[PDB]
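Sample 3 of the quickstart, ligand zinc ion:
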Amino acid sequence: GSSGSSGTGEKPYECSICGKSFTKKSQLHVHQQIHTGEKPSGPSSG
Ligand SMILES: [Zn+2]
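Result:
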């Protein structure tokens, strides 16, 4: 978070991966795609 305009009511749809926000659910759905690369898992499970 940040110290400034806290406690306002950011868009109803806010990404958790990056932290972006979207006023249209759909937008978020498609956006999430952008996060189809970086993975928390290092080694490829067998
Ligand atoms: Zn995101």
